[PDB]
Design a protein around this nucleic acid. Structure first.
Lengths: 114, 122, 54, 119, 207
RNA sequence: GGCACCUCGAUGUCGGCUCAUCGCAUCCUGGGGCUGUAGUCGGUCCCAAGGGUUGGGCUGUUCGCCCAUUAAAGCGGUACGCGAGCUGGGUUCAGAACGUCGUGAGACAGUUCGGUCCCUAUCCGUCGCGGGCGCAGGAAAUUUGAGAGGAGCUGUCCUUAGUACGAGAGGACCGGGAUGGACGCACCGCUGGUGUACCAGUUGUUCUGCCAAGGGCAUCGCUGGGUAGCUAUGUGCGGACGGGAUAAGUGCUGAAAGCAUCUAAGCAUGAAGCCCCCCUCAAGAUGAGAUUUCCCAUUCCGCAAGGAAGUAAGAUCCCUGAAAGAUGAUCAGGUUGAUAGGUCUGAGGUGGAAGUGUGGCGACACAUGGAGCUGACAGAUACUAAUCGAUCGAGGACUUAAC
């Protein structure tokens, strides 16, 4: 896909920090409520890390007011401003789907600091 | 993504506990329902203290869905639990408060007053 | 699925018209032959362009 | 895609592993033309594993090649010959190790046959 | 009406200006050459026989070599007319390279569909499956032909069969970006056909 | 219902699941005339089959009732459409009961429980794909489109407007603007689904002499993810913008009947109808078309008619295969070569391999190291296999006219 790679390069976002699939990074996202853009911080654990250049995405997730939220973020979207990895975490796998059902302290066991 | 005969737990202080769906108001027509859709519904269960009582037939607007909602930005949202707020005729919610996160998809619709009661919007 | 009637000899032979197998292609061997169909080792000398492998 | 041969998928692994071992001792084998085409893809990869000489690579050969005796008196394992004989013989060459000449159809069921041998 | 037909290679996502995600199809498009120019007073109709993807002489037939000789061009593969070009448009033999298409133009797309192979009616026509339980042997099968009175199957009655490989129009697709240096087209929305298949890029009807 | 002309050496009943199509006395949408039509919303009679025609509860049911909807949830024909497609729930076999009738044996458009629905497609039919010959010489191509099919439905909101109207209450016609439903056509790059020669973890037993590290089997042993391909519940698009003659209507000039009068003369207006615009198959449209570019005008017989043997353009047999595919066919190719496999470099997937060292009593953990493993996805590389060859294939019929 060398030609396909040539197109994606123009929209490539090298500014984004490198990170492991298992961590509590905090994506910033402007929201056009109209007219001013609010900045909603959203901490959570990433799970999926699908490949495919610009099409790459990751699934940050967070419990909120007793209920979880699954807000996927594409890796190279313009809407992201900055990403801060508050904590690193050891992971025996790559697809941590199971943790969402394991409320609540059990989820923290996979969230061990590194 | 919600089919007919799909129980949906209450998200507001209507006094109801769980609320089964009846039929989507959209078209002849659509069976599926994302967020912001209005659906007539039955109250299968309710808390003893509240205006709502079991077996009542009242419309309710969807607030949360297990299915991943789509946006033009490409961002997706899928809550751990499905939810709806009870509403009759005028779209002001019967619930004094709305528990949990609320989808922003309601905001594009003139449903904005409901959004104001939300503790947080995602 | 029981047929209503016996087939005529005409229709039968007409069905027989396409049933016949086609003749395989053949070529003379560079070494001796004869002959050898294309892209397969001869059962005779066993030569293959033109190496002798058995 | 990969050919099925109609065999059960569990059988398919053993069916390939058996042919890879029999080629080691016999150096050459005649089988059906279609199975022969499938055969070259598996065996040549095994030869690549023997190139590095790595101890980890030898264990990978055990996953496929079975523990059958090769040459008499020498008592070499079927795995061992690849690391001692075939590897040195193809240190220069890179791929194309297994030519497969076609052969006439078998009388017993019309099945086409093909010779398989290293080169 | 212009149409630089060319093979697609791979699907891509492309965002610009607005933050919304826009699906995009790559197209090889350029270069193309006018092998011939039809005339209504002689050939009976207005058309231009554009070619695509030049190839070595070894694959070219002798009569094909003569057809391009008038075009002052090397022998080339597929050829298609595009009624109705605005004559005189271009001089004979002139090259074309994506210059016509702007990002704002709406563009119809036509091409051979990807082969699904021989298939059942449910895929071929979307017919509902029969019950899988309650002792019913019936499922997947197309069902009754219809009325007994005609004593014949109605023509055009749906039956399972091979699908795909037929040319299929997809109207009103929109271009996203233009890359003339790489001869790339970037049309929004799905474009029908197998990977690396030829694809026409005719101008959309307006308005 | 009546009659007993089809069938009692077999026409398998009812209601559904399946797919339909047809006819209008048109449920809705579009066109209107009259209203006890203020507006809004209706009533009625005329145009109109183009399209759309509901999800459940009760009952074997049709029907009907009820609930929630919808622009509307119209009827009927097609062996009360379809069982060599399916369902046996209802009646319509043999068992058993209740109630009633009969001395009994049994019976009951009275009811209840259980109860083998057989069949390899010959022909005509239809959905797809080839092999032949023809198309007055052989070919490679590109297409004209006689004809044929598909598509054909609509909801809301934002404006003009809170204006026209109405005491108020209510609330438009028309012209524009955005967003959905139902359905249809396509593609995976997102969302995912699957993914049996991909990766990892793990159980029992057995096999590699024992360790470490693996193999076989147990549904792929099980479990967690997933390339490609295949896919919708995902995405993108579709019914748009307009003409031609009209239907019911609305008419304009004017006569037969000096006035009058849509018509008898003559000119208009006028609909999701019809014809095209839109998309698709199509010159076996034996009416066999048209245009572009190639091969040449042979060699042998027979005075003639006509027939053979080679060849040119080109194609095939065979072979590497897939963007194709049941088999043919189609397309990419056949050694001045990337067609497939392999080999290298990547992408993606699964993710800290083996070995070694260190910490710990052990079990394990850490380091070496985003390592290792990689089935179909890419980029190059003749390293292998697409050998060597063979076969098919035209010498342009006779007339008339213009030259």
């Amino acid at each position: 896909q060398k030609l396909i790679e040539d197109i994606t390069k123009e929209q490539l976002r090298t500014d984004l920090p490198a990170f492991r699939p298992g961590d509590t990074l905090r994506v910033h996202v402007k929201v056009v409520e109209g007219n001013r853009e609010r900045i909603q911080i959203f901490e959570g654990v990433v799970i999926k890390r699908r490949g495919g250049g610009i099409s790459e995405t990751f699934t940050v997730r967070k419990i909120s007011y007793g209920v979880g939220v699954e807000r996927t973020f594409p890796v190279h979207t313009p809407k992201i401003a900055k990403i801060e990895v508050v904590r690193y975490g050891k992971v025996r796998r790559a697809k941590l789907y199971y943790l969402r059902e394991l409320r609540g302290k059990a989820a923290r066991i996979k969230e061990i600091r590194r | 993504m919600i089919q007919q005969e799909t129980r949906l737990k209450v998200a507001d202080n209507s006094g109801a506990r769980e609320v089964l769906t009846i039929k989507v108001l959209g078209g002849s027509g659509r069976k599926t329902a994302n967020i912001g859709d209005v659906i007539v519904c039955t109250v299968k269960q309710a808390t003893p203290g509240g205006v709502v009582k079991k077996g009542e037939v009242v419309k309710a607007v969807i607030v949360r869905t297990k299915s991943g909602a789509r946006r033009s930005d490409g961002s997706y949202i899928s809550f751990d639990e499905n939810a709806c707020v009870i509403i009759r005729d005028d779209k002001s919610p019967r619930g004094t408060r709305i528990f949990g996160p609320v989808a922003r998809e309601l905001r594009e619709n003139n449903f904005m007053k409901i959004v104001s009661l939300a503790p947080e919007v995602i | 699925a029981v047929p209503f009637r016996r087939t005529s000899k005409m229709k039968k032979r007409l069905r027989r018209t396409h049933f016949k197998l086609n003749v395989p292609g053949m070529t003379e061997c560079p070494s001796c032959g004869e002959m050898k169909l294309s892209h397969r080792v001869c059962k005779a000398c066993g030569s293959y362009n033109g190496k002798d492998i058995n | 895609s990969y050919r099925k041969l109609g065999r059960t998928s569990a059988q398919r692994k053993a069916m390939l592993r058996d042919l890879t071992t029999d080629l080691i001792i016999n150096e050459r084998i005649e089988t059906t033309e279609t199975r022969a085409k499938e055969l070259r893809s598996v065996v040549e990869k095994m030869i690549t594993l023997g190139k590095r000489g790595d101890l980890h690579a030898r264990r990978q050969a055990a996953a496929y090649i079975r523990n059958e005796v090769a040459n008499e008196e020498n008592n070499q394992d079927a795995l061992q010959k690849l690391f001692s004989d075939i590897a040195t013989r193809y240190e220069e060459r890179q791929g194309g190790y297994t030519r497969i000449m076609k052969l006439g159809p078998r009388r017993g069921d019309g099945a086409p046959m093909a010779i398989i041998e290293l080169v | 009406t212009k149409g630089i037909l060319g093979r697609k290679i791979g699907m891509t996502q492309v965002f610009a200006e607005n933050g919304d995600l826009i699906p995009v199809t790559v197209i090889e498009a350029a270069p193309n050459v006018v092998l011939q120019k039809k005339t209504a007073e002689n050939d009976g109709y207005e058309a231009i026989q554009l070619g695509f993807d030049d190839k070595r002489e070894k694959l070219s037939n002798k009569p094909e070599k003569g057809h391009v000789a008038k075009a002052e061009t090397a022998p080339k593969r597929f050829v298609k007319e595009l009624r109705g070009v605005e004559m005189d448009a271009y001089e004979v033999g002139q090259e074309v390279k994506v210059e016509i298409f702007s990002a704002g133009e709406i563009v119809d797309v036509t091409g051979v569909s990807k082969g699904k192979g021989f298939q059942g009616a449910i895929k071929r026509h979307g017919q509902s499956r029969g019950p899988m339980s309650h002792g019913s042997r019936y499922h997947r099968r197309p069902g009754s032909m219809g009325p007994v009175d005609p004593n014949r199957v109605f023509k055009g009655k749906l039956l399972p069969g091979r699908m795909g490989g037929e040319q299929i129009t997809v109207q009103n697709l929109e271009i996203v970006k233009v890359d003339a240096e790489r001869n790339l087209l970037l049309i929004k929305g799905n474009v029908p056909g197998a990977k690396k298949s030829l694809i026409t890029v005719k101008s959309a009807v307006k308005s």
